[PDB]
């Protein structure tokens, strides 16, 4: 809980450009063969993202301010990233909400949380039979005063560690506006070695969540495993990005999906 | 309007129609009715469940249910005949199917007969003060039915008790379960009972030969508050057939509009409701039911 860990070591934050990332469907309005003009919250082509990575010894969970929305962009093999957490003072002093993913399903709930210094879920004890299966819950002690609570439907995710190049990709828009919070999600596969490949995207809607809470800052959870001070966390690479009041032309094909946007 | 070379005339404003042709007005087709859709009423709250349920908190014991995210239907409430008392206070029953609110509290709790009267704002008595009380401005309702069929039973039911006794009148929506002994003197107690001390939980004597008006009647208080935060609790809906290949004026869940529908070859991401052309105009729209 308030235990940091052993080999944890901070590293100074560099930063590496993007290239179309930001582009998302603005709303449910379905349009095909027309190039339209949206104004919103967007991440600025070529803007300079931060550089981030936990391995088992340097390993990042900044706290990170939220401002009006962010954009996260991070690639995975034995899924180290958990989820989020969002709220003013992150603690039970008021509400906050929590994104995470046990494994099993997709839990979304808004309650007064417990503060921890180092928040996360672990494991021990792989070696033959290889587990994986949650056991230490080390993100709040106690809970209380829930506004609102959502859970996914189940699903077996893998966490079996492994090496080499990076084979999945997940990105990610998370703002809140008019007390509205809004999410999308893409999953795509990649083969990417460091940095980020350069191709373009359309972020999906993930879900609806009508919380209406303020949240100035936010936090990433990651996964600890070992074979809770001294368990570790595999190679993972994540990042972020902060969202300005930009202008993009989205060009709709036939079947309504965006080929290209064009900042202005 | 008689024929229409007479049209020519008032168009022109002159009895004298030259050789040729003339519009003498732009013909449009009125909707031959109204259309209306929505989606299902499925994912409600239990609402009769809360009233069902076996046992019920005593009333200074009473449990306090918190609904929100769902749709309401009160029609079968009122119609199904369940009840010995309905009352609104602020809200007429049958507006509460089109207003929508944020936070729904239903209170549950046994009490007299008698003393369902004093549940009312700005009330007072024994149950009102020290157990209960409805503040002025309570926009609920309340509801209660003779419960003497199950709570009731032979030999007496002492499981629900009150608080007869209390240093002070109770505040509006406030809960004290404190067992402390009540001091009426300044003789003082200290837990013991004695002179000028006594317990201030008592049992509501339950009999099934007990009078109609003492009769224990159980109690469901639903507390309509209306926040800041978003709304979400509302009516239910109406989702009547649909019609196509006519003139009809439609309404689809918060759109609005004249025209004709057409199932077309067009596929809208699932992920996206309604469309719109170069215009800014809808040329076609997704059923809020059917898909």
Redesign the interface.
Known sequence: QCVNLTTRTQLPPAYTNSFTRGVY?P??????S?LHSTQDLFLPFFSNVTWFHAIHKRFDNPVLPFNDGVYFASTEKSNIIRGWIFGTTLDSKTQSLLIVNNATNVVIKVCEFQFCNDPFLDVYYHKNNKSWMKSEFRVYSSANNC??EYVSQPFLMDLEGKQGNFKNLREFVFKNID??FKIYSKHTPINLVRDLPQGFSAL??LVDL?I?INITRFQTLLALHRSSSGWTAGAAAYYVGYLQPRTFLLKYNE??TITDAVDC | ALDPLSETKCTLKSFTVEKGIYQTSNFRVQPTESIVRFPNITNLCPFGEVFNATRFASVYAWNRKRI??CVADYSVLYNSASFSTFKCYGVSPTKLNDLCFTNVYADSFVIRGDEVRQIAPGQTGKIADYNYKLPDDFTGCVIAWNSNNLDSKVGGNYNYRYRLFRKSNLKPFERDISTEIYQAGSTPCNGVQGFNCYFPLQSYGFQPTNGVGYQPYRVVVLSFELLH??A?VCGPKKSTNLVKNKCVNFNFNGLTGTGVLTESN????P??????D?ADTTD?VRDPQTL
């Open positions: 469907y709303d449910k309005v379905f349009r095909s027309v506004t609102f007390g509205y999906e809607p009508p209406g079947n309504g | 929100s995210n935060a978003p979400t067009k596929k809208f991401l992920f996206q409701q309604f469309g719109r170069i076609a």
